[PDB]
């Protein structure tokens, strides 16, 4: 899967850090950054159905 965050909707709350830490970080400047940009993890689209501004895409 890939995967992609869009900064402009990221509002840094962390929750995808909190369900899929090896895919996802909140980084210090308050916004989430892909640290597996394509992986098999069930868990990125989790994350990716649990972010509150559908910030996160998976495909
Ligand atoms: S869940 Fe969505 S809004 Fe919250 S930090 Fe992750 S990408 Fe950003």
New binding site residues.
């Given amino acids: 899967m890939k995967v992609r965050?869009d900064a402009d909707a990221?509002?840094?709350?962390?929750?995808?850090e909190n369900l899929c830490p090896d895919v996802?970080q909140?980084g210090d400047d308050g916004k989430?950054k892909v640290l597996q940009p394509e992986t098999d993890l069930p868990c990125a689209k989790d994350?990716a159905d649990?972010?509150?501004?559908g910030?996160?895409s998976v495909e």
Avoid: H, N, Q
Avoid at 50 to 53: H, L, R, W
């Fill in positions: 965050v990221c509002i840094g709350c962390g929750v995808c996802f909140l989430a994350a649990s972010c509150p501004t910030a996160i």
